Amino acid sequence: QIFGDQVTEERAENARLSAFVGAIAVGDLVKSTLGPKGMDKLLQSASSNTCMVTNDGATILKSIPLDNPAAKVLVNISKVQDDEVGDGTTSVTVLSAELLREAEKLIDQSKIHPQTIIEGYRLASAAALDALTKAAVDNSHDKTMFREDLIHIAKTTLSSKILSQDKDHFAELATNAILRLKGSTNLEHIQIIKILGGKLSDSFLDEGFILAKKFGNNQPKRIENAKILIANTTLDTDKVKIFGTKFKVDSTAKLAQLEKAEREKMKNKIAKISKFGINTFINRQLIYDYPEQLFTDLGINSIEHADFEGVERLALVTGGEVVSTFDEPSKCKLGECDVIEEIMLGEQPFLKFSGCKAGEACTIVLRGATDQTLDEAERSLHDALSVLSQTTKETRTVLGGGCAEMVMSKAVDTEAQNIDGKKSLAVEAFARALRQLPTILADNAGFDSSELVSKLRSSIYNGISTSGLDLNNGTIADMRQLGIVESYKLKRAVVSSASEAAEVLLRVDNIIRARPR
Amino acid sequence: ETRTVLGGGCAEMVMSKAVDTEAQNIDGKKSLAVEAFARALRQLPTILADNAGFDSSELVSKLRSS
Amino acid sequence: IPLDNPAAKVLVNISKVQDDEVGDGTTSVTVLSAELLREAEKLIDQSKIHPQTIIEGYRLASAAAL
Amino acid sequence: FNNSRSDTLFLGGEKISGDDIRNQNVLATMAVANVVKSSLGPVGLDKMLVDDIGDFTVTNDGATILSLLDVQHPAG
Amino acid sequence: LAENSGLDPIGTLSTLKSKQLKEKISNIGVDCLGYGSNDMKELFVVDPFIGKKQQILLATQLCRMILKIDNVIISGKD
Amino acid sequence: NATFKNKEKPQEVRKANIIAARSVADAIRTSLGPKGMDKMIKTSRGEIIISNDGHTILKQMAILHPVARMLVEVSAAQDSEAGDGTTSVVILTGALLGAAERLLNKGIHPTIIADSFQSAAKRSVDILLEMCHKVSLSDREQLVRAASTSLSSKIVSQYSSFLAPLAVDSVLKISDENSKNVDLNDIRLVKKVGGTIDDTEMIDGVVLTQTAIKSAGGPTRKEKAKIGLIQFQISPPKPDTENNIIVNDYRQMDKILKEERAYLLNICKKIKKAKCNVLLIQKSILRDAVNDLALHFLSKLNIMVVKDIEREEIEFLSKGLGCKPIADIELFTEDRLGSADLVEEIDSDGSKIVRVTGIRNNNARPTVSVVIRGANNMIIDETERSLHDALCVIRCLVKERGLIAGGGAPEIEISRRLSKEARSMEGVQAFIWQEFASALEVIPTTLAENAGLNSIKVVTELRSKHENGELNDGISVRRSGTTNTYEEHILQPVLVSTSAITLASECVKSILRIDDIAFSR
Amino acid sequence: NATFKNKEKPQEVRKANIIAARSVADAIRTSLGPKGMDKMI
């Protein structure tokens, strides 16, 4: 009797059924309740007079006691989706059940490795998110008025904050820190520089990626046509703690000979650096003068102590990679920038890059009179940038009514075209669950889903990518003419949660029952 | 007779993509009926690979995609 | 093999057509005829509508196969 | 005891082997030896041989008893 | 490891034995993580010699101890 | 991971037939070797028989299991081709079935399992030919020693001195060169009561099973004779319906006699026109074969008559003598006759057996019938079966030249070579070469178990000695250990080990190819 | 033709609730009007 105290392990045959059929039975509770035309469920207790009827997916799943240990996993997935947004919990559980329903066919009559099935979804979901981006529309129209509406909202976010001293200058910095990105609005694309000895109104916006530390001793302060390499290694005194070692040598000069041999091993790595044809090198650790002197003859400037976030933000602006090792010469993702200029602000030397390759980003340099003005401004600035970024990601919608679900199917079928051997059925199974979403929505409407979904697939396959399902008239019409749209953030949340839920469940060859609390 | 075609499961899959071409332009309710006919044509190389002692899912998937 | 299934007796009479017309490849005919039943069972159970329409789907699909 | 009705190895008859047949060979020769155990030597004593008809006979010869003794057993 | 990686356990094992014999003596293992080809030695994937030696000693020490117990006595609950 | 589930289980049904087939090999396992244990089998009729011969056990076992019945057909083909090794070929089949059980547990389809045994059987024979010692039929000293060792396993031993060249000289006349398989049915062993073992006559031409006419007029000898085979029988008319002969008058008596004597004479006249000196009449106990009036008629025409010919010899005499069967006298002519210089009746003691020499035919070739004599009935019987096994060993050398040292010697070395040659393969097949080599060691391991020797100890002694030497060591029950089987006069022909491996690969194939069974009437 | 599969069987739950609720309405049906039948509990 393994485990014990209500803990047990399911049989490999029953665990696959408990993770699939057992999870579908939980998804079947919210299956018929999906959509505005969905049905209702009954929740009855032992007293039987306390019961209630509701269509809420979060209420039905949490109220019903689940003895299936695999069903408790879907409860945790529902909590992750509820944290993102309070709507769409029903659609995630139903879509996850459709992925597991085809997964039973991806094992029995298929014989495909389960991790490859997940990797088959990771490649299919990537094409699904890309298809939603191409078909994405927005209510941002009349952007000329929308760009003006952002600077007024930024002023409202500055209330109660010490930045309220000047609203016009600070709201312009926050507004230009978003619209000028033309891409991801995450704070990783915005660098904050906190300095002393000035006024808050003297702050300015610079897209040149200003970083505090300098590079080189006798090296020049200007670099033209820079080639940036990103790597992490210790070129100066490795094994940071040498205390306790015993070096057996006949004389002290032989102890330094091993250090010279270590310096000879430095040329092995330095030679691989010169094979890349770079005038600039990035390192998180320090570098001793001898390997740095060899960089002077090769014309390589070394920026040191970039930490990690500073390295990742440098790879995004210059289009580089964070890899710390050299697998093979002339194979890598390299960045570059037009001009590297060293400036001085606040009695400290700074570095201002210029002309980064495909660079889209900004660096907000906050100049305060003390540490209290710098710390409270950065926390309040990110709150103002979060409100401005909320209007960019939200109110941006996509065509609904079965459209977006079928449009993703066409992109996944395109991914199912060029694919390796074992993932051909795994990618195709993902497109089947995408077509089951409008199928179930047509189930509760009272119409024929097999007729509407089949005609919807053949319609979008050749031309007419904007068509969708009309539940009112029971036919196929243009979604742009009917004005049926659904949020893009809701689509990304359901697809991401379905991939995370399938990542844990498909790897299951056995189920460990949780301990009751 | 003595007029032949290319064998070895090729022509069986050539008909599968031809029926899939028929499954491209098709009526509303006749899409599944025609598409399933191509599924039965793709089960012929599956049976030949199972009786020969090989992996049918690996061969047919690479045979269909090619 | 004696077949008590009245539907299986009809399948034996259908296989006699291949023996009288040609007389070679009768096994491949019975297998492919059973594979069409495997797909027809998947089309019916997922529909439960009269198969006569599905029969028209095979006639249009068999023309593309020929 | 008495191994019978094997679920596998389908045959037109029962099949035994192992220590079961080796123990039956000892029990078979033990009952046969006990018949001639008391008849050994001139000091031995006669025994009665009863048939299915109900008649019997009395003789002390061990050769005539074993000839008329009914034993069903491969080693017996 | 070959079964959990989606590869033939007999086919991959027999393939690795031929690469380390007919070609040359080296270390080429099964692929645990996704890569383009074989020869993990090119990937610089290393395991500690003292760690791998500690595993085979404890596995042998326990296998002998299991063979040294031919009898199991388990008392009931009074 | 997650693989093909195989909801329907046709393989599990086959695995049940494999276990049922391995259970038959476990019963035959104890009977392997001359020291093997006997098996008691009680027939449904009530007969109690016992023997250690695997050919007689599987024949009377009455297996109702269809897959296990294949082991009986392999033992029949093992005795028909090689003549020896019917017990070891069944045990080798069970080992391949046991090794296939591990292959099915690894997810291997039985088609590759059966196809890999084909290359494994062809390679094992080629390796066996490399170690085999080539011998030729032109050497008469090697054939006598090979036949003398096969006769030392029977009650008759010291009298085999004259028995050994009997089987050797009989085959050398029928062997010619490059004849491949030579049917031993052409060699007829005649068993007659009386005489002794030292009295034997080869009579390479032919020998009959029957005496001559004991009635009045029997010639009992003929010179320059032509021998036909008559399936008909010369008798007065006797319809299968109810008939009766009633003579109420002298005219009725002559009427019956004239009709019978003329009908018999008309048949006798057609025989003389074809110049038929000797006649062979098929034995029929229902009606009369040859009437006494026909014996007096054929005696006046100087035609030798031998009647009551056994029906079993009708098929044999039609082949060796090069004649044709005659159904009716109308089709009975000279073209179906033979040619015989002298046909006489020679009685050693009490037998009165007829022999014929000088067939002198191009189509008929030297079909030899050997006469075996002895005092007790148990003599001529065991002698016939002992010489039959000696003919099988010599038959192996004629079809395939060369011999090997028996006692499990080739099974150990081939298993060691296939284990080293398994590195040259790749993929699923390479693991099968290792399991195929381990399956070849069941024969020498069982020989050590049935002989009382230590199982694990003797098998390791073979792998140790066969490394330095080649085919010089094997298991011998005479020395109670591992010794040289060539010095102990233990010689197993190569065709026995070749046919045992060939029939094993074909038997396991016919087994694993069965994925299901259904009632068919 | 090809229509929706209807793998689940929700009708057995609805039809069992409709028949059970119809017996309640038929019991109250006899009480309609001033001349209707009185029910005892």
Side-chain angles (χ1 to χ4, degrees):
Chain A
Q1 294 177 336
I2 62 172
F3 294 159
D5 290 344
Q6 294 300 321
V7 177
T8 188
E9 182 178 2
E10 296 301 321
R11 182 178 181 172
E13 183 178 2
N14 290 336
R16 294 182 182 175
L17 296 175
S18 178
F20 296 160
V21 176
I24 293 170
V26 176
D28 289 344
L29 297 174
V30 296
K31 183 178 179 180
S32 64
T33 60
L34 177 63
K37 294 181 181 297
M39 296 297 103
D40 291 344
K41 300 298 183 180
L42 177 63
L43 299 176
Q44 186 174 355
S45 64
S47 296
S48 296
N49 62 346
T50 59
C51 56
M52 66 176 285
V53 175
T54 187
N55 58 32
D56 186 5
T59 300
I60 295 169
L61 296 175
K62 293 176 179 177
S63 178
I64 293 171
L66 296 174
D67 290 344
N68 189 340
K72 294 176 179 177
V73 176
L74 296 175
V75 176
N76 291 336
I77 302 301
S78 296
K79 294 176 179 177
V80 175
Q81 184 63 59
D82 290 344
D83 290 344
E84 296 301 321
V85 62
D87 187 5
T89 300
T90 299
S91 63
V92 175
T93 301
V94 174
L95 178 63
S96 296
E98 295 301 321
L99 295 174
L100 297 175
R101 181 177 65 84
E102 295 301 321
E104 183 178 2
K105 294 176 179 177
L106 294 175
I107 295 172
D108 293 344
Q109 294 177 336
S110 296
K111 184 179 179 180
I112 297 169
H113 188 277
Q115 185 63 59
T116 59
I117 295 170
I118 296 170
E119 294 178 351
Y121 294 143
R122 294 182 182 175
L123 296 175
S125 296
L129 295 175
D130 290 344
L132 295 174
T133 300
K134 294 176 179 177
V137 297
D138 57 353
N139 290 283
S140 296
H141 186 278
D142 291 344
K143 294 176 179 177
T144 59
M145 295 300 294
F146 177 80
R147 293 182 182 175
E148 183 67 14
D149 290 344
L150 295 175
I151 188 169
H152 298 291
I153 295 170
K155 293 176 179 177
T156 59
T157 59
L158 295 175
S159 178
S160 296
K161 302 299 183 181
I162 61 172
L163 296 176
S164 64
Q165 185 64 59
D166 186 4
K167 293 177 179 177
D168 291 344
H169 182 62
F170 295 160
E172 183 178 2
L173 297 175
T175 300
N176 291 337
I178 302 301
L179 296 174
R180 293 182 181 175
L181 295 175
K182 294 176 179 177
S184 178
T185 59
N186 291 336
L187 296 175
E188 295 301 321
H189 300 290
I190 295 170
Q191 184 64 59
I192 303 301
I193 302 301
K194 292 188 295 184
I195 58 174
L196 294 174
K199 294 177 179 177
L200 296 175
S201 64
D202 291 344
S203 296
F204 59 90
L205 177 63
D206 186 4
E207 295 178 351
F209 181 77
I210 295 171
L211 61 84
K213 302 300 182 181
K214 63 189 183 70
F215 61 90
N217 291 336
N218 61 345
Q219 295 300 321
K221 294 176 179 177
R222 182 177 181 171
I223 296 170
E224 294 178 351
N225 191 30
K227 302 299 183 181
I228 295 171
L229 175 64
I230 293 170
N232 188 29
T233 188
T234 299
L235 295 175
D236 186 5
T237 304
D238 58 353
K239 291 181 295 297
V240 296
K241 301 299 182 181
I242 194 168
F243 178 80
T245 189
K246 293 177 179 177
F247 294 159
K248 183 178 179 180
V249 293
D250 290 344
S251 178
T252 301
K254 293 177 179 178
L255 188 147
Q257 185 63 59
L258 296 175
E259 294 178 351
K260 293 177 179 177
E262 183 178 2
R263 294 182 182 175
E264 293 178 350
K265 294 176 179 177
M266 295 177 182
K267 293 177 179 178
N268 291 337
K269 301 302 287 185
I270 294 170
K272 294 176 179 177
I273 294 170
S274 63
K275 293 176 179 177
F276 296 159
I278 60 170
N279 58 32
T280 301
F281 178 80
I282 304 301
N283 190 30
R284 181 178 182 171
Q285 295 300 321
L286 298 175
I287 292 171
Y288 181 75
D289 291 344
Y290 177 77
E292 183 178 2
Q293 185 64 59
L294 296 175
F295 296 159
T296 300
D297 291 344
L298 296 175
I300 295 171
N301 291 283
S302 178
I303 295 170
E304 62 186 343
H305 184 62
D307 289 344
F308 59 97
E309 290 177 351
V311 175
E312 183 178 2
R313 294 182 182 175
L314 177 62
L316 295 175
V317 296
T318 59
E321 61 184 343
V322 296
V323 297
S324 63
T325 59
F326 297 159
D327 290 344
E328 183 177 1
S330 295
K331 293 177 179 177
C332 53
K333 183 178 179 180
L334 294 174
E336 63 184 343
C337 55
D338 290 344
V339 175
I340 293 171
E341 183 178 2
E342 182 177 1
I343 61 172
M344 182 176 284
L345 295 174
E347 294 178 351
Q348 186 174 355
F350 292 158
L351 296 177
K352 182 179 178 180
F353 295 160
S354 178
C356 296
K357 182 179 179 180
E360 294 178 350
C362 56
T363 298
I364 295 170
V365 176
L366 296 175
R367 185 184 295 273
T370 187
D371 290 344
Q372 294 178 336
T373 59
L374 295 175
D375 290 344
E376 295 301 321
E378 183 178 2
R379 294 182 182 175
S380 63
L381 177 63
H382 297 166
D383 291 344
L385 295 174
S386 296
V387 176
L388 296 175
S389 64
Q390 185 64 59
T391 59
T392 59
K393 302 300 182 181
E394 185 178 2
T395 306
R396 179 182 294 177
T397 59
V398 296
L399 296 175
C403 183
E405 293 83 357
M406 185 65 73
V407 174
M408 293 183 286
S409 296
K410 183 178 179 180
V412 175
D413 289 344
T414 300
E415 183 67 14
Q417 186 174 355
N418 188 340
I419 193 65
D420 57 352
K422 293 177 179 178
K423 294 176 179 177
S424 178
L425 296 175
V427 176
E428 183 178 2
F430 179 80
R432 294 182 182 175
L434 295 175
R435 292 192 297 273
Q436 294 300 321
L437 296 175
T439 299
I440 296 170
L441 294 175
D443 292 343
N444 292 335
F447 295 157
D448 186 4
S449 64
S450 178
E451 182 179 2
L452 296 175
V453 175
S454 178
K455 293 176 179 177
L456 178 64
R457 181 179 180 274
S458 64
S459 64
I460 296 171
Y461 177 77
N462 190 29
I464 303 170
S465 64
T466 59
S467 64
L469 296 176
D470 186 4
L471 296 175
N472 291 283
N473 290 283
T475 187
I476 294 171
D478 186 5
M479 294 296 103
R480 293 183 181 175
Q481 294 177 336
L482 296 175
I484 295 170
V485 295
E486 294 178 351
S487 178
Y488 175 78
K489 183 178 179 180
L490 177 63
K491 301 299 183 181
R492 182 177 181 172
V494 175
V495 175
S496 178
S497 296
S499 296
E500 293 177 350
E503 183 178 2
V504 176
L505 295 175
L506 294 175
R507 295 174 64 185
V508 170
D509 290 344
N510 56 33
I511 297 171
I512 306 301
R513 185 181 295 274
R515 185 182 296 275
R517 296 176 63 185
Chain B
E1 185 177 2
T2 306
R3 179 182 294 177
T4 60
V5 296
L6 179 63
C10 183
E12 294 177 350
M13 185 65 73
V14 174
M15 293 183 286
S16 296
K17 63 181 178 181
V19 175
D20 289 344
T21 300
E22 183 67 14
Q24 185 174 355
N25 189 340
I26 193 66
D27 190 4
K29 295 184 175 75
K30 293 177 179 177
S31 64
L32 296 175
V34 175
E35 183 178 2
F37 179 80
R39 294 182 182 175
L41 296 175
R42 292 193 297 273
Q43 294 300 321
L44 296 175
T46 299
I47 296 169
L48 295 175
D50 290 344
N51 291 337
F54 296 158
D55 186 4
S56 64
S57 296
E58 183 178 2
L59 295 175
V60 175
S61 296
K62 294 177 179 177
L63 181 65
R64 181 180 180 274
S65 296
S66 64
Chain C
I1 293 172
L3 296 174
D4 290 344
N5 189 340
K9 293 177 179 177
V10 177
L11 178 63
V12 176
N13 291 336
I14 295 170
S15 296
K16 294 176 179 177
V17 176
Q18 185 64 59
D19 290 344
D20 291 344
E21 182 67 14
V22 176
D24 186 5
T26 301
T27 300
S28 64
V29 175
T30 300
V31 174
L32 179 62
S33 296
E35 295 301 320
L36 295 175
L37 297 175
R38 295 176 63 185
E39 296 301 321
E41 183 178 2
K42 293 176 179 177
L43 294 175
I44 292 173
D45 291 344
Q46 293 177 336
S47 64
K48 294 177 179 177
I49 308 300
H50 299 289
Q52 185 63 59
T53 299
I54 296 170
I55 296 170
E56 294 178 351
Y58 295 141
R59 294 182 182 175
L60 296 175
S62 178
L66 296 175
Chain D
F1 296 160
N2 191 30
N3 189 341
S4 63
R5 295 183 181 276
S6 64
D7 59 353
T8 188
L9 181 63
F10 178 80
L11 295 174
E14 295 301 321
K15 182 173 178 290
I16 61 172
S17 63
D19 290 344
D20 291 344
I21 184 169
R22 294 182 182 175
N23 290 336
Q24 294 300 321
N25 291 337
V26 176
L27 296 175
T29 189
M30 177 178 71
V32 176
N34 290 337
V35 176
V36 296
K37 183 178 179 180
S38 296
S39 296
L40 178 63
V43 296
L45 297 175
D46 57 9
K47 294 177 179 179
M48 294 177 182
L49 278 66
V50 176
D51 59 9
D52 291 344
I53 297 170
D55 189 4
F56 59 90
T57 187
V58 176
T59 186
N60 62 345
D61 186 5
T64 59
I65 295 171
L66 295 175
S67 296
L68 297 175
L69 176 61
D70 186 5
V71 174
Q72 295 300 321
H73 190 278
Chain E
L1 296 174
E3 294 177 351
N4 290 337
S5 64
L7 296 175
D8 186 5
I10 294 171
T12 300
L13 177 63
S14 178
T15 300
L16 298 176
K17 294 176 179 177
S18 296
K19 302 299 183 181
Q20 294 178 336
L21 177 63
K22 294 176 179 177
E23 294 178 350
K24 186 179 179 180
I25 295 170
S26 178
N27 296 131
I28 295 171
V30 180
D31 294 345
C32 296
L33 59 83
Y35 180 76
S37 178
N38 61 344
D39 188 6
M40 294 294 101
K41 182 179 179 180
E42 183 178 2
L43 278 69
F44 296 159
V45 176
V46 297
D47 289 344
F49 177 80
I50 190 65
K52 301 302 287 185
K53 183 179 179 180
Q54 187 65 59
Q55 294 177 336
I56 60 172
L57 293 175
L58 296 176
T60 300
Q61 185 64 59
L62 178 63
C63 182
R64 295 176 63 185
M65 181 172 175
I66 295 170
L67 295 175
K68 291 176 179 177
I69 295 170
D70 59 352
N71 189 341
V72 174
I73 302 301
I74 295 170
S75 296
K77 294 177 179 177
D78 187 5
Chain F
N1 58 31
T3 58
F4 180 79
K5 183 179 179 180
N6 195 31
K7 183 178 179 180
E8 294 178 351
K9 293 176 179 177
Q11 295 177 336
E12 295 301 321
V13 176
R14 183 180 66 256
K15 293 177 179 177
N17 291 336
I18 294 170
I19 295 170
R22 294 176 63 185
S23 296
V24 176
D26 290 344
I28 307 301
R29 181 177 181 171
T30 59
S31 296
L32 179 63
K35 302 299 183 181
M37 296 296 103
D38 291 344
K39 183 179 294 297
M40 182 64 73
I41 295 171
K42 183 178 179 180
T43 59
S44 63
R45 294 182 182 175
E47 183 178 2
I48 294 170
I49 60 172
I50 184 169
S51 178
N52 61 345
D53 187 4
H55 182 62
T56 59
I57 292 171
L58 295 175
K59 183 178 179 180
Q60 294 300 321
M61 184 171 175
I63 295 171
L64 295 176
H65 190 278
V67 176
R69 292 181 182 175
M70 294 177 182
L71 296 175
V72 176
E73 294 178 351
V74 174
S75 296
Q78 186 65 58
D79 181 67
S80 296
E81 295 301 321
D84 187 4
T86 60
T87 300
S88 63
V89 64
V90 176
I91 296 170
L92 178 62
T93 299
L96 296 175
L97 295 175
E101 183 178 2
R102 295 182 182 175
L103 296 175
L104 295 175
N105 291 337
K106 302 299 183 181
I108 298 170
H109 191 278
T111 299
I112 294 172
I113 297 170
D115 290 344
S116 296
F117 294 161
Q118 294 178 336
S119 296
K122 294 176 179 177
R123 179 60 179 165
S124 179
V125 175
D126 290 344
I127 294 170
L128 178 63
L129 295 175
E130 294 177 351
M131 295 183 286
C132 183
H133 300 290
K134 182 178 179 180
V135 296
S136 64
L137 296 175
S138 64
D139 186 5
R140 294 182 182 175
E141 294 178 351
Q142 185 64 59
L143 296 175
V144 174
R145 292 192 297 273
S148 178
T149 59
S150 178
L151 296 175
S152 296
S153 63
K154 302 299 182 181
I155 296 171
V156 176
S157 296
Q158 294 177 336
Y159 296 140
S160 64
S161 296
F162 295 160
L163 296 175
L166 177 64
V168 174
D169 291 344
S170 63
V171 176
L172 293 175
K173 302 299 182 181
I174 66 172
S175 64
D176 290 344
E177 61 184 343
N178 290 336
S179 63
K180 294 177 179 177
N181 189 341
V182 176
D183 186 5
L184 295 176
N185 290 336
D186 290 344
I187 295 171
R188 179 60 179 166
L189 296 175
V190 176
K191 292 189 295 184
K192 299 299 183 181
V193 177
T196 188
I197 296 171
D198 290 344
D199 186 5
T200 301
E201 294 178 351
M202 177 178 71
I203 303 170
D204 59 353
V206 67
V207 174
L208 297 175
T209 59
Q210 295 300 321
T211 61
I213 302 301
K214 294 177 179 177
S215 296
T220 62
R221 182 178 181 171
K222 181 59 166 61
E223 183 178 2
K224 294 177 179 177
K226 295 176 179 177
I227 296 170
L229 275 68
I230 295 171
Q231 294 178 336
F232 179 76
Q233 295 84 0
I234 297 170
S235 64
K238 294 181 181 297
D240 290 344
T241 59
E242 182 178 2
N243 57 33
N244 192 29
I245 295 171
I246 295 171
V247 175
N248 61 345
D249 187 5
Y250 176 78
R251 294 182 182 175
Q252 185 64 59
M253 177 178 71
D254 290 344
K255 183 178 179 180
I256 302 301
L257 295 175
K258 292 176 179 177
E259 292 177 350
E260 292 177 350
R261 293 182 182 175
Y263 176 78
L264 297 175
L265 178 63
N266 290 336
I267 296 170
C268 297
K269 291 166 62 181
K270 294 176 179 177
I271 295 170
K272 179 61 174 172
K273 294 176 179 177
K275 294 176 179 177
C276 300
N277 292 336
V278 175
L279 299 175
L280 295 176
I281 296 98
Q282 186 174 355
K283 183 178 179 180
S284 178
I285 60 172
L286 178 62
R287 293 173 296 180
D288 290 344
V290 176
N291 190 341
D292 290 344
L293 296 175
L295 294 174
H296 182 62
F297 295 160
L298 293 173
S299 178
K300 183 178 179 180
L301 274 65
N302 192 30
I303 294 170
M304 180 172 175
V305 177
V306 176
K307 63 188 183 70
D308 290 344
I309 302 301
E310 183 67 14
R311 294 182 181 175
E312 183 178 2
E313 296 301 321
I314 302 301
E315 183 178 2
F316 177 80
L317 295 175
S318 64
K319 294 176 179 177
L321 296 175
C323 296
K324 294 176 179 177
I326 289 100
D328 187 5
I329 304 301
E330 294 177 350
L331 59 82
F332 177 78
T333 57
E334 183 179 2
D335 290 344
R336 293 179 179 84
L337 296 174
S339 295
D341 291 344
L342 177 63
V343 176
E344 62 185 343
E345 184 179 3
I346 302 301
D347 185 5
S348 296
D349 186 4
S351 296
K352 293 177 179 177
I353 187 167
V354 177
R355 59 176 182 183
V356 177
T357 304
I359 295 171
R360 295 182 181 276
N361 190 340
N362 290 337
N363 290 283
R365 64 185 182 91
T367 298
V368 177
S369 296
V370 177
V371 176
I372 295 170
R373 292 178 63 84
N376 291 337
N377 61 345
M378 295 300 294
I379 295 171
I380 61 172
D381 290 344
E382 183 178 2
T383 300
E384 184 278 336
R385 292 192 297 273
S386 64
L387 295 175
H388 182 62
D389 290 344
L391 294 174
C392 295
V393 176
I394 297 170
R395 181 182 64 194
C396 295
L397 297 175
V398 176
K399 183 178 179 180
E400 183 178 2
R401 294 182 182 175
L403 59 83
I404 60 172
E411 296 301 321
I412 300 300
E413 183 67 14
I414 293 170
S415 178
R416 292 177 63 85
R417 293 182 182 175
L418 294 175
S419 178
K420 294 176 179 177
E421 293 177 351
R423 294 182 182 175
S424 296
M425 295 300 294
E426 184 178 2
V428 176
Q429 294 178 336
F431 178 80
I432 296 170
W433 290 95
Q434 294 178 336
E435 295 301 321
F436 178 80
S438 296
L440 296 174
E441 294 178 350
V442 64
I443 295 170
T445 300
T446 300
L447 294 174
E449 293 178 350
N450 290 337
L453 296 175
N454 189 341
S455 64
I456 190 66
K457 183 178 179 180
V458 175
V459 176
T460 57
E461 293 177 350
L462 296 175
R463 292 177 64 86
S464 296
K465 294 176 179 177
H466 296 166
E467 183 67 14
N468 290 283
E470 183 178 2
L471 186 62
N472 61 345
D473 287 340
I475 295 171
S476 178
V477 297
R478 180 182 294 176
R479 297 295 181 190
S480 296
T482 59
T483 187
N484 189 341
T485 59
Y486 177 78
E487 184 178 2
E488 295 302 321
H489 300 290
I490 295 170
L491 276 68
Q492 185 174 355
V494 64
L495 189 146
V496 175
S497 296
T498 299
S499 64
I501 296 170
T502 299
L503 294 175
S505 63
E506 294 178 351
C507 183
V508 176
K509 182 179 179 180
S510 63
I511 293 170
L512 296 175
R513 289 177 64 86
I514 302 300
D515 59 353
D516 188 4
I517 184 169
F519 177 80
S520 178
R521 181 178 181 172
Chain G
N1 289 282
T3 58
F4 179 76
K5 181 178 179 180
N6 191 30
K7 183 178 179 180
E8 295 177 351
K9 182 61 174 172
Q11 294 177 336
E12 292 177 350
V13 176
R14 291 193 297 272
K15 293 176 179 177
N17 291 337
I18 293 170
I19 294 170
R22 182 177 181 171
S23 296
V24 176
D26 290 344
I28 307 301
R29 181 178 64 84
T30 59
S31 296
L32 178 62
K35 302 299 183 181
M37 296 299 294
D38 291 344
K39 183 178 294 296
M40 183 177 285
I41 294 171

